[PDB]
Amino acid sequence: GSLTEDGLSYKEKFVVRSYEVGSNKTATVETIANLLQEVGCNHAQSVGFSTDGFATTTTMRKLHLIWVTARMHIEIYKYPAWGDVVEIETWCQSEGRIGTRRDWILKDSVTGEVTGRATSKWVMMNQDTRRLQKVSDDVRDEYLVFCPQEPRLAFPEENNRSLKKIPKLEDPAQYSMIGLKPRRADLDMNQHVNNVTYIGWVLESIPQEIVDTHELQVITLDYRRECQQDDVVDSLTTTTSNDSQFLHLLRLSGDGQEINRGTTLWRKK
Amino acid sequence: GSLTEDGLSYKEKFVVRSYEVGSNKTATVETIANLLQEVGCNHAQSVGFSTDGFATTTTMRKLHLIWVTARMHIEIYKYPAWGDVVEIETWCQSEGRIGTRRDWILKDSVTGEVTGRATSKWVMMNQDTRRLQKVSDDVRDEYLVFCPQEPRLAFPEENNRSLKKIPKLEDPAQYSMIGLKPRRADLDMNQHVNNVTYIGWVLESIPQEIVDTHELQVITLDYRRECQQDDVVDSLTTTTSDSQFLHLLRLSGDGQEINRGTTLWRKK
Ligand SMILES: COC(=O)N1CCN(c2ccc(F)cc2)CC1
Ligand SMILES: COC(=O)N1CCN(c2ccc(F)cc2)CC1
């Protein structure tokens, strides 16, 4: 991987592995999500930021401040097959008082065609209290020299799907998968549940008949609270709709505290 | 990756990814196990065998025959750090009536030092009945041209750790993790639980204090029965000692055994 010529974006190629593919012999959406985080980490490494997933500066580390994902939105047109080469380009931008954004474009290396795109919203928070706090000008200024100044959006449309408000699923859910819990492989280097694990958990409550006859086109996931290493999660889904759409909710098995909400859109094969 | 000059082995390099590392910022043993299966798959692809994990021929597919792992044994001296390049060489050999073997050697690309080694035993079985069945001469002859003729062992020594018999853990277990179940990411392209998932499940019942103060040096795992997509598993561990453990994976309900194993950990 490498920074591009203008140094305002980062590109990396990946060859799809045998264990990375699903029943369609193409990369799963969780494999794609892992690759997005990977190219994000390599971008941070390339310009001197932390590589722990929080992409911090020395100033933020003295204050115990971190960047955390508030929303992930992925749209895939073609999943790459086993052995194919996928090229991923990523960039960041500041969105002032609202927080920050990281975007991605996925392309087939052989044809140069755009096979998918993704966007994510980030907020700043004290890692100990979990209280949000607005970025100071001195912290922000250190990042702006690595971002394009003119708007560069993977999702330019004014009322596009990536910004839609997601409602809260009401009981009873149409489908459920209960008692889900993370194992050590679901944790990162600092013992936090990897953001991709929550994608896998949302999808566990999709009926297998849908997975067998449809392909996932869009997933939007809001991140409200983290699931700790010793927590247990319930995954709930209700059909909201040749296309199928679902409303999703992840909550703690016991008291029902919400950790994530989302929506998915599937197209018939 | 590529076949070597004599065409009797396969080599591939991997750069360790950010999500592949544990709390030590080095590759987890499950990441290593995934890489071993990956280089195995690329070796099969390179010479025309199936790439579904069963490494079959057209003749075996007509008979619904598959190769299945009976034992995996891995020894790691140094786990590769995030961003390091690890080179892995793999080869196969027939062991006649006992079954077959696939070996691996892991090396640090920069120094050329051996950082780990692994071996696995395989048996042939009918995919539908799960009955064992001996390899016919016509089936085995198609594989021998891709294997070294002289013995080439990652663990050459007579009666070494890789061939030791593993006993069955007796109740009560010292430690347990119950109600483990696979999610879609634990399944392969054919909807079977990936062999690496069973490694993760064995390790779930190791106390976190051991993981925090020790490094896994050796893992030997026998594979007795497949955990289906809708099965639920209990992971049991008892200290037998460096720290050593006896492990057992069994179905949550009736206690049917699916795996047994041992691990050896070195203080950091
Ligand atoms: C792993 O973290 C990220 O990918 N992000 C997204 C980009 N971020 C950012 C911060 C300040 C700014 F002015 C512009 C962008 C930081 C968090
Ligand atoms: C994924 O499967 C493997 O890795 N295997 C199984 C098949 N193997 C083999 C080796 C020599 C032989 F004569 C017949 C079969 C051993 C390696």
DSSP letters for chain A: -EE-TTSS-EEEEEEPPGGGB-TTSBB-HHHHHHHHHHHHHHHHHHTT--SSSS---HHHHHTTEEEEEEEEEEEESSPPBTT-EEEEEEEEEE-GGG-EEEEEEEEETTT--EEEEEEEEEEEEETTT--B-PPPHHHHHHHHTTS-SS---SS--TT-GGG---PPPPSSPSEEEEEE---GGGB-TTSPBPHHHHHHHHHHTS-HHHHHHEEEEEEEEEE-SPPPTT--EEEEEEE---EEEEEEEEEETTT--EEEEEEEEEEE-
- Do A233 and A190 meet the contact criterion of CB atoms below 8 Å apart? no
- Choosing from B43, B73, B227, B259, the catalytic residue is B227
Contact in structure between A60 and A49 (CB atoms under 8 Å): no
CATH of domain B175-267: 3.10.129.10
Between CA A240 and CA A218 the distance in angstroms is 14
What is the rounded CA–CA span in Å between residue B125 and residue B49?
A: 17
**Number of Cβ pairs closer than 8 Å across A and B?**
79
Please give the CATH number for the structural domain made up of B2-155.
3.10.129.10
Residues B180, B183, B187, B190: is their CA dihedral positive or negative?
positive
**Mutating which of A10, A43, A189 best tests the B interface, going by the most B Cβ atoms within 10 A?**
A189
CA B150 to each of CA A94, A131, A157, B230, B242: distance values in angstroms, whole numbers, following the listed order: 63, 65, 65, 44, 36
Expressed in percent and rounded to 5, the helix, strand and coil fractions of chain B are 20, 40, 40
Across the interface, which of B23, B42, B191 has its CB nearest the CB of A189?
Answer: B23
By the CB < 8 Å criterion, does A53 face chain B? yes
Whether the CB of B251 is below 8 Å from some CB of chain A: the reply is no
Does any CB of chain A come closer than 8 Å to the CB of residue B129?
Answer: no
Give residue A87's Cα distance to chain centre.
17
A67 lines ligand 1 (CB under 6 A): yes
**Pocket mutation for ligand 2, best pick of B51, B93, B122, B140 (most atoms within 8 Å of C-beta):** B122
Q: Is B147 a catalytic residue?
A: no
d(CA A183, CA A264): 25
Q: Tell how far the Cα of B122 is from the centroid of ligand 2, in angstroms.
A: 7
Question: CA-CA distances (angstroms) from residue B170 to A196, B175, B207?
Answer: 37, 12, 19
Ligand 1 pocket member A68 (CB < 6 A)? no
B247 is catalytic: no
Q: Is B40 in the pocket of ligand 2 (CB under 6 A)?
A: yes
Chain A CA closest to residue B195: A19
Mutate to test the interface with A, among B19, B45, B208 (most CBs of A within 10 A): B19
Cα R_g (chain A), whole angstroms: 18
Long-range CB pairs of A95-100, under 8 A, 24+ apart, other chains included: A95/A121, A97/A134, A99/A70, A99/A123, A99/A124, A100/A67, A100/A135, A100/A143
Q: Quick one: A112 exposed, middle or buried, by C-beta within 10 A (0-12, 13-18, 19+)?
A: exposed
CB contact under 8 A, B184 and A19: no
**Ligand (nearest to CA of B91):** 2
Give the resolution in Å.
Answer: 1.6
Q: What is d(CA A233, CA A252) in angstroms, rounded to the nearest whole number?
A: 5
User: Which amino acid, A232?
Assistant: V
Active site residue B190: yes
Span(s) in chain B for CATH 3.10.129.10: 2-155, 175-267
Strand-pair category, A175-180 with A214-223? unpaired
DSSP labels, A29-98: HHHHHHHHHHHHHHHHHHTT--SSSS---HHHHHTTEEEEEEEEEEEESSPPBTT-EEEEEEEEEE-GGG
Domain with CATH 3.10.129.10 in chain A: 2-163, 175-268
CA of A46 to the centre of ligand 1 (A): 14
CATH for the stretch A2-163: 3.10.129.10
Shortest-distance ligand to the CA of residue A47: 1
Whose alpha carbon is nearest atom 11 of ligand 2? Answer: B94
**Domain A175-268 carries which CATH code?**
3.10.129.10
Q: Where are the beta strands (DSSP E) in chain B?
A: 2-3, 10-15, 65-76, 85-94, 100-108, 114-126, 175-180, 214-223, 233-239, 243-251, 257-267
Tokens representing B178 are 């119950």
**How far, in Å, CA of B103 to CA of B36, rounded?**
9
Q: Cβ–Cβ of A204/B183 closer than 8 Å?
A: yes
* Residue given tokens 């459920």 in the structure block: A176
Write phi, then psi, for B97 (nearest 5 degrees).
-70, -20
Q: Select from A10, A48, A52, A43 the least CA-distant residue to A142.
A: A48
Residues of chain A contacting residue B210, judged by C-beta atoms under 8 Å apart: none
Q: Which residues of A138-177 are buried (b: 16+ CB within 10 A; e: fewer)?
A: ebeeebeebbeeeeeebeeeeeeebeeebeebeeebebeb
